[PDB]
């Protein structure tokens, strides 16, 4: 191992944000602090001087951004309430408003977060699991936090993946979320502005490990067209990918890379097939230096490759 | 799931003690409390009424006993010091002396504990991992806690299994400990009263998952003879067993039962092959009610069988 790597919690929550190839990765240290590693042409930070706040040990870690102008990082307090660390350009980091709402969730809740796509306005949708095991949406539309739509029952401790995109022919945002049901299937719920939350539940995987990690991205929005990728940890102790491609729908799935038992997973993307992309980066633990966070890369130049072996502070 | 099963921490530390078929099982709830479930002709307890103390979330949990007259349960404080919850018949539960010594260990340390075999005196040996990744023994011999032997380097966050037995031709106790080295092998170290700690590490398994759980038991001590069993979680997401049997040594190993990715494991035993035994009981998580603790049984009557499907409070 390395002393650095030993600072990273084993099975830490992991989240990532980006503006194209300018990246940030969030994780929890063994003391419960949430730290930020950074990529601006090289890997940096992730040290005890790069702490953005504290959360209960073992907390979920979620993040979403508008480029690197606005970053929001979501975790659980010791009281199992949702909280938010906020970065705005020209201010820096501060404690966001979410914590003050004291939204209480199940102690084993995961979190997913999106800024709504295709507007300049800062609108947020956060997803977590209430004590009754339902998935609840929480909303910020610029005038205070309030509950949004309740999306129904899920497996207690389900992972939650989320993405927002805006079709170029629509005048409002779309949302897709994924989670696991009691029967262990992985499913999608979907929001479009005309149909609202669709009264359906699309199965994307028939049977996954209980409380498997779930992470999702989308790219290449067009006229009534989108590309999506959902990742989870399968029973083979590897991350699997599920693909949605416009014109084919949910048409393929398969193994991507090995991970430790119970690894968490984060995904970021940029670009699209139409612009010499997309680019994908996954973050996870695969046993490098025992507890370091590792990266997997997809790009048009070289396809599927392992990226940075061990993120800072390793 | 069930409301009770939802209180059990997913990947909780697990420990167990017994006097023959009178059983106690310790685990951590989602709030960090350490709870006791019991078997006295039937299963009970494990509720908010059966809390014995508090420990850092995700703490190791180890326990040892002299029958059910003296029980000691070891975990980490938020400060990463060793602490002890103690039960003595008549006294009940109390905060043991160990905490006062403020022994600082790695935040990712595991714990093993034994009462030394073959004496009525209360003599304890506790094993944990220091920040320099060495395995340290801590001793109680009736006059305060002291550091004992340091057993050298180990993989950071290694599991630690321990047992003590007394050969019927010896005049003092033996100790065996197992842990994982940086190369990912699982090794034994051994103490006997004529040799002290043997200089050599003995490999019991060539390659195991990093930071796999390790738990051990022994039974059937005779003249220069013993039987031992060591359990760990393999890369196939099952508990494997490693067998020492007198006259054959370390001669077999294999899978026992499936578990959740990253399950912890506890083992208790009683009786012997000579006297229509032994009895073995393993405790682990295998996904029953998502987060319940389950039991596996070995006995002469029926051999290998699943036992209680979901321990109390499930
Ligand atoms: C073309 Se270098 C490649 O992409 C960068 C944006 C980073 O993800 C880096 O770790 C990786 O090796
Ligand atoms: C321009 Se300051 C730099 O980039 C911001 C987007 C944040 O990630 C901050 O923590 C970092 O130090
Ligand atoms: C100056 Se409001 C700030 O930004 C919004 C987009 C929300 O994240 C809110 O909780 C936060 O405090
Ligand atoms: C407008 Se949200 C309000 O102001 C922000 C700047 C933060 O202090 C946040 O915690 C608070 O709830
Ligand atoms: C305009 Se309805 C409002 O915003 C949508 C984008 C969804 O988050 C929905 O659940 C919410 O009630
Ligand atoms: C009108 Se297809 C709609 O949007 C796609 C992008 C998918 O999420 C599909 O499951 C959904 O029903
Ligand atoms: C046309 Se390759 C397809 O799309 C890429 C964006 C990656 O998700 C890759 O894993 C997949 O097989
Ligand atoms: C002969 Se019942 C058998 O043994 C008891 C001692 C308990 O382990 C119980 O759960 C098991 O089914
Ligand atoms: C006779 Se009290 C009963 O048995 C003791 C040995 C302990 O396990 C205690 O917690 C339990 O309530
Ligand atoms: C009446 Se001392 C009591 O029992 C000893 C055996 C030790 O476990 C010690 O730490 C504890 O406080
Ligand atoms: C009699 Se030496 C004393 O007790 C032995 C049983 C071992 O625990 C050893 O490490 C310790 O120094
Ligand atoms: C004099 Se064999 C001695 O004791 C056995 C019980 C085993 O632990 C073995 O590895 C060790 O060398
Ligand atoms: C004589 Se069967 C042998 O010993 C029992 C005590 C159990 O450990 C069993 O799994 C093993 O195969």
């Amino acid at each position: 191992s390395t002393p650095g790597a030993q600072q990273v919690l084993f099975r830490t929550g992991i989240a990532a944000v980006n503006s194209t190839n300018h990246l940030r990765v969030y994780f929890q240290d063994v003391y419960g602090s949430i730290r930020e590693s950074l990529y601006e042409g090289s890997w940096a930070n992730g040290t005890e001087k790069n702490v953005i706040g504290n959360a209960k040990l073992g907390s979920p870690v979620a993040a979403t951004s508008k480029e690197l102008k606005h970053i929001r990082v979501y975790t659980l307090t010791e009281g199992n309430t949702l909280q938010e660390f906020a970065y705005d350009s020209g201010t820096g980091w501060y404690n966001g408003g979410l914590g003050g709402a004291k939204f209480q969730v199940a102690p084993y809740s995961x979190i997913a977060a999106v800024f709504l796509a295709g507007t300049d306005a800062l609108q947020l949708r956060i997803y977590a699991q209430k004590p009754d095991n339902t998935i609840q949406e929480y909303m910020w539309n610029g005038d205070g936090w309030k509950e949004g739509t309740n999306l129904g029952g899920a497996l207690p401790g389900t992972g939650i993946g989320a993405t927002s995109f805006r079709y170029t022919d629509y005048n409002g945002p779309s949302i897709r979320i994924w989670f696991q049901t009691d029967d262990l299937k992985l499913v999608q719920r979907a929001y479009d502005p005309h149909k609202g939350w669709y009264p359906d539940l699309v199965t994307i995987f028939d049977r996954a490990p209980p409380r498997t990690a779930i992470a999702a991205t989308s790219f290449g929005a067009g006229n009534s067209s989108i590309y999506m990728r959902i990742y989870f940890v399968n029973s083979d102790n590897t991350i699997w990918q599920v693909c949605w491609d416009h014109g084919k729908g949910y048409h393929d799935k398969g193994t991507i890379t090995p991970v430790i038992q119970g690894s968490e997973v984060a995904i970021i993307s940029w670009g699209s097939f139409a612009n010499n992309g997309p680019d994908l980066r996954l973050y996870f633990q695969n046993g490098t230096y025992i507890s370091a966070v590792s990266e997997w890369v997809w790009n048009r130049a070289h396809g599927s490759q392992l990226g940075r072996s061990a993120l800072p502070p390793a």
Side-chain angles (χ1 to χ4, degrees), chain A residues 105-206 208-297:
Chain A
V105 297
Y108 47 75
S109 181
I111 312 170
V114 297
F115 276 103
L116 297 177
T119 169
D120 281 339
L122 274 64
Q123 296 169 345
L124 288 151
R125 297 293 182 274
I126 312 310
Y127 301 89
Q129 188 170 40
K130 284 184 158 182
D132 72 354
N133 296 320
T134 71
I135 300 305
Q136 180 68 53
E137 177 185 66
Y138 305 85
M139 315 187 290
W140 176 271
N141 292 308
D143 289 284
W145 287 99
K146 60 181 82 200
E147 290 189 336
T149 306
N150 185 283
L151 299 171
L155 184 140
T158 183
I160 312 163
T163 195
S164 182
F165 53 87
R166 179 161 153 167
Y167 292 126
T168 52
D169 57 342
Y170 277 41
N171 78 341
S174 294
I175 309 167
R176 302 286 184 278
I177 71 159
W178 298 264
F179 55 83
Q180 182 170 41
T181 50
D182 288 316
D183 57 11
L184 304 176
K185 302 177 201 326
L186 298 192
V187 300
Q188 175 199 263
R189 295 222 56 188
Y191 175 93
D192 283 339
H194 54 333
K195 277 159 183 208
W197 291 98
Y198 287 67
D200 65 16
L201 199 71
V202 174
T203 301
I204 64 157
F205 210 80
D206 285 346
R211 304 191 177 184
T212 192
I214 303 170
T217 197
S218 61
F219 61 86
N223 293 322
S224 293
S225 62
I226 192 62
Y227 303 82
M228 314 185 292
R229 304 285 182 268
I230 311 94
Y231 302 88
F232 70 94
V233 177
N234 207 350
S235 51
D236 63 6
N237 300 334
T238 76
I239 290 162
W240 277 49
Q241 177 183 250
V242 176
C243 299
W244 173 282
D245 293 298
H246 180 66
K248 291 208 59 101
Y250 282 121
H251 69 99
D252 204 8
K253 62 202 185 293
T255 196
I256 293 299
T257 203
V259 295
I260 64 166
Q261 293 172 31
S263 183
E264 301 297 348
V265 180
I267 176 77
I268 47 167
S269 68
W270 59 101
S272 62
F273 286 122
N275 69 47
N276 294 263
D279 268 72
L280 305 179
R281 305 286 186 282
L282 283 170
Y283 303 93
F284 48 86
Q285 285 175 311
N286 71 10
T288 301
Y289 302 132
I290 311 305
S291 53
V293 174
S294 295
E295 181 188 58
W296 173 91
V297 174

Side-chain angles (χ1 to χ4, degrees), chain A residues 38-62:
Chain A
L38 166 158
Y39 182 90
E40 294 275 346
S42 57
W43 283 104
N45 293 173
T47 78
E48 82 169 315
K49 297 176 77 217
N50 309 115
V51 168
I52 61 163
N54 291 95
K56 72 182 270 199
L57 272 177
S59 179
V61 179

Side-chain angles (χ1 to χ4, degrees), chain A residues 4-140:
Chain A
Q6 293 168 176
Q7 300 169 13
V8 184
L9 184 66
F10 202 74
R11 306 193 175 88
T12 181
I14 310 168
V17 301
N18 66 301
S19 177
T20 68
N21 65 343
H22 312 267
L23 327 171
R24 304 299 183 264
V25 179
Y26 308 93
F27 67 91
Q28 189 170 53
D29 73 26
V30 288
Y31 309 106
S33 295
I34 306 305
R35 302 186 184 184
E36 183 192 65
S37 294
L38 166 158
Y39 182 90
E40 294 275 346
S42 57
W43 283 104
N45 293 173
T47 78
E48 82 169 315
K49 297 176 77 217
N50 309 115
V51 168
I52 61 163
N54 291 95
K56 72 182 270 199
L57 272 177
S59 179
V61 179
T64 183
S65 75
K66 302 195 86 60
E67 310 299 329
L68 300 172
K69 191 185 183 183
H70 306 290
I71 305 174
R72 302 290 182 273
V73 182
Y74 299 93
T75 60
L76 296 182
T77 66
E78 291 183 353
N80 298 308
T81 59
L82 295 173
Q83 71 175 346
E84 175 186 52
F85 311 142
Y87 175 89
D88 296 320
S89 293
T91 293
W93 290 97
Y94 63 94
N95 195 247
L98 184 62
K102 311 294 290 212
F103 293 126
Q104 179 139 86
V105 297
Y108 47 75
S109 181
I111 312 170
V114 297
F115 276 103
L116 297 177
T119 169
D120 281 339
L122 274 64
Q123 296 169 345
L124 288 151
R125 297 293 182 274
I126 312 310
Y127 301 89
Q129 188 170 40
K130 284 184 158 182
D132 72 354
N133 296 320
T134 71
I135 300 305
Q136 180 68 53
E137 177 185 66
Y138 305 85
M139 315 187 290
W140 176 271

